[PDB]
């Protein structure tokens, strides 16, 4: 039948892709960076502790000014913190308490949230009445919302559990573009620094690179053995990091179109919830299910330090724009700033 | 406060007011009864609903308590990716239809509905998140099932069975079959009720089970256990 011919052609294409990727691997990243000096031991201590959430904290995000942050908890609360003075700026009660994602607009005028209600809610912060009110309610996904990211004041990108991603025009509340191709729940997304492409990681143990305007999949990266939970983009914009349930982190290059480095240890067997990069891109911070955060030398693939101050699973972490601190949230209803 | 300016002091006062509001809301929501509905296929959800896409929430007050009821039957995604969001609910109400003892699924051959319901109970009961959560097992359609034994014996579900073909014992055999799936018989137990058409015993049994669960939760908090 025609389906047999088509699947044989697909297998031939896969073999050709594998051969093309194999022919490009002459040297490894470890060999090239074998003689570079190590970073030593990274010692960081807690400076601030933000209290006020009475349930598990599920997401957090940093502002562009590197002073305000937002955090969502599964008690129907979206709290905006001023980290310098620990003061609370705003507390927003959500209509649905099963929130699972957060986003802060780059301009600082809007916040976005969503979760098990299959709806992305956009709240306006600057009003003439002095209260934060719901400005938009985007609907159309058929699965729980897992990640959302602003592009500007009038464009958002969301990923959800129906194996699809969407680009929404906020003003009209319509799905401008739909990205399809994943065979499992999409768990994370990350925008490029120039905001023209984005990478998405799903439960089919694969990551995909999407062009925002064209809505087409450019490259697919494989290698993980379980569901991918976190994805982060390298500061340069030519590589990215992936964390999954098999207790390993991996680094992928866009131009080489293959894998570069693997970060794993024999004493780590739990899953990874979050990944982030430092300002220069030399350190990679990953939060684990064993209540810890690990700092990895991104070049030599060596353990550098640990952050251990949480009594439950670490669920989210983020590095400020100027790289002066790192914020870590956890299921024990606390957030901590480290530097 | 020695060096704080006027606006800094006002911001601190605003944050204090926000904290007070958060504390009040948390202490109000702490004394609430939250139930999670579970089942396989269509076995009775609206009928279990007694006002006395996404996730469906139902709020009702019985005597002076606030009852929240969460139904996630419309979620078609992977269960293991959000099942930890409900770690901390007061009780899990699992509904099972007794009429599925002889009729199998037509979508997939040899997939009996009762056997397909036992696997879900096995997964939910023995879970890393629900080790201590109380489970209330409802066995619905008792009457309609009762008259079906006259034609098809229980061997259609469990061929390794021999006993009187009456309701009063065949139903108890299923009662035992579902209860033995629990591998944590100590420090955890199941309250099983046979659903009746009187429309009042269901809420009374649920209230009794919830009261017994809250008593054991209070025992741990006040250092007696």
């Amino acid at each position, epitope marked *: 039948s025609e389906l047999d011919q088509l699947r044989q052609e697909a297998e031939q294409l896969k073999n050709q892709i594998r051969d093309a990727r194999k022919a490009c691997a002459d040297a490894t990243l470890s060999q090239i960076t074998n003689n570079i000096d190590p970073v030593g031991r990274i010692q960081m201590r807690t400076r601030r502790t933000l209290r006020g959430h009475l349930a598990k904290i599920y997401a957090m995000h940093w502002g562009t000014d590197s002073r305000l942050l937002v955090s969502a908890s599964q008690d129907g609360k979206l709290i905006i913190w*001023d980290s310098y003075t620990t003061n609370k700026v705003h507390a927003i009660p959500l209509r649905s308490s099963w929130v699972m994602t957060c986003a802060y607009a780059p301009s600082g005028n809007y916040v976005a949230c969503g979760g098990l209600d299959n709806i992305c809610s956009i709240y306006n912060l600057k009003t003439r009445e002095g209260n934060v009110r719901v400005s938009r309610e985007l609907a159309g996904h058929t699965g729980y919302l897992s990640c959302c990211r602003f592009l500007d004041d009038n464009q958002i990108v969301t990923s959800s559990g129906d194996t699809t991603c969407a680009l929404w025009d906020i003003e009209t509340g319509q799905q401008t573009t739909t990205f399809t191709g994943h065979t499992g729940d999409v768990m994370s997304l990350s925008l490029a620094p120039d905001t023209r492409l984005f990478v998405s990681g799903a439960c089919d143990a694969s990551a995909k690179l999407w062009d925002v305007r064209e809505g087409m999949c450019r490259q697919t990266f494989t290698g993980h053995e379980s569901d991918i939970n976190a994805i982060c983009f390298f500061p340069n914009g030519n590589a990215f990091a992936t964390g999954s349930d098999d207790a390993t982190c991996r680094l992928f290059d866009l131009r080489a179109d293959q894998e570069l480095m693997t970060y794993s240890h024999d004493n780590i067997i739990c899953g990874i919830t979050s990944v982030s990069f430092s300002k220069s891109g030399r350190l990679l911070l990953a939060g684990y299910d064993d209540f810890n955060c690990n700092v990895w030398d991104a070049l030599k693939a060596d353990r550098a330090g640990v952050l251990a101050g949480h009594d439950n699973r670490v669920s989210c972490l983020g590095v400020t724009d100027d790289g002066m601190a790192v914020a870590t949230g956890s299921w024990d209803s606390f957030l901590k700033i480290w530097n | 406060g020695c060096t704080l300016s006027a606006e800094d002091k006002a911001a601190v006062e605003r944050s204090k007011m926000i904290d007070r509001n958060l504390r009040e809301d948390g202490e109000k929501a702490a004394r609430e009864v939250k139930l999670l509905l579970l089942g396989a296929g269509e076995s009775g959800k609206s009928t279990i609903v007694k006002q006395m896409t996404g996730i469906v929430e139902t709020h009702f007050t019985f005597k002076d308590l606030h009852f929240k009821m969460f139904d996630v039957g419309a979620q078609r995604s992977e269960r293991k990716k959000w099942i930890h969001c409900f770690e901390g609910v007061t009780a899990i109400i699992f509904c099972v239809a007794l009429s599925d003892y002889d009729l199998v699924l037509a979508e997939d051959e040899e997939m009996n509905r009762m056997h397909e319901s036992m696997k879900l109970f096995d997964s939910i009961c023995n879970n890393k998140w629900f080790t201590d959560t109380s489970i209330i097992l409802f066995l619905n359609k008792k009457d309609l099932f009762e008259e079906k034994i006259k034609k098809s014996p229980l061997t259609i579900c469990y061929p390794e069975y021999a006993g009187s073909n009456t309701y009063e014992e065949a139903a108890a055999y299923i009662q035992c079959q579902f209860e033995d799936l629990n591998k944590r018989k100590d420090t955890k137990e199941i309250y099983t009720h046979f659903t009746c058409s009187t429309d009042t015993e269901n809420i009374r049994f649920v209230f009794a089970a919830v009261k017994d669960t809250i008593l054991q939760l209070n025992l741990k908090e006040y250092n007696l256990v």
Partner: single-chain antibody, 232 residues
Framework: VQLVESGGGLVQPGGSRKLSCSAS????????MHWVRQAPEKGLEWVAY????????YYADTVKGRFTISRDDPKNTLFLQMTSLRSEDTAMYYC??????????????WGQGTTLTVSSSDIVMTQATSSVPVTPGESVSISCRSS???????????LYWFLQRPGQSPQLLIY???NLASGVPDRFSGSGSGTAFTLTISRLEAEDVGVYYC?????????FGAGTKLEL
């Protein structure tokens, strides 16, 4: 957003009265409130302040022990009860809203005040100008000076620039010496140092005529400048 004042009228010396300010169109309970009075032909003068939640109250030295400020939040109203009124208390009173958090703009709305006529350590803000004859289409520069340093240890300089058009309530132009208020054209700019401050207007549009005031918010006894008048 609206604030409406009621009260005023002829009062004999030694009498009492209750001025009221009714708010509509915004969350009243989230805003701190000020009473600010202006004499018949004088400059602005701060009178009293009540915090959100009524947790903090501040009075001026002239009215301390005589005036009382209160708020009713369910009714969305603000009261000023005045007793033992002297002949120097004849003025127009405004109720002003102000909210304080990181990045907020206090003093951003002024009600249309009510007139009262009675029958017959502190930072000093100097505006050493009275009248500036001007022509449309040319830049202007108003200057204000303080007797202290308004720059705090956290890098914030607490200076505010307000404009009062003839026959209108004052409106906010600049807050914290550099931040332009919402709804203000880009022509207005603020700059300065710890002590000397300058407000620059790039191109006049024959509408900016009026009196410009500089106010300090470093410490709660609030001081206004004498004011600078722009006439053509």
């Amino acid at each position: 957003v609206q604030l409406v004042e009621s009260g005023g009228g002829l009062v004999q010396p030694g009498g009492s009265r209750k001025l009221s300010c009714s708010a509509s169109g915004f969350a009243f309970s989230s805003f701190g409130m000020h009473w600010v009075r202006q004499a018949p032909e004088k400059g602005l003068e701060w009178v009293a302040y009540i915090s959100s939640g009524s947790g903090t109250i501040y009075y001026a030295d002239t009215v301390k022990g005589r005036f009382t400020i209160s708020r009713d939040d369910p009714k969305n109203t603000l009261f000023l009860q005045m007793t033992s009124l002297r002949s120097e208390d004849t003025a127009m009173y405004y109720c002003v809203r102000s909210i304080y958090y990181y990045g907020s703009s206090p003093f951003d709305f002024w009600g249309q005040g009510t007139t009262l006529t009675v029958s017959s350590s502190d930072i000093v803000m100097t505006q050493a100008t009275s009248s500036v004859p001007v022509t449309p289409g040319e830049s202007v520069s108003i200057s204000c000076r303080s007797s202290k340093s308004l720059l705090h240890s956290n890098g914030n300089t607490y200076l505010y620039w307000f404009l009062q058009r003839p026959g209108q309530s004052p409106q906010l132009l600049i807050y914290r010496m550099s931040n332009l208020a919402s709804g203000v054209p880009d022509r207005f700019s603020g700059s300065g140092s710890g002590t000397a401050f300058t407000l620059t207007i790039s191109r006049l549009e024959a509408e900016d005529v009026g009196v410009y005031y500089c106010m300090q918010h470093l410490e709660y006894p609030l001081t206004f400048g004498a004011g600078t008048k722009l006439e053509l």
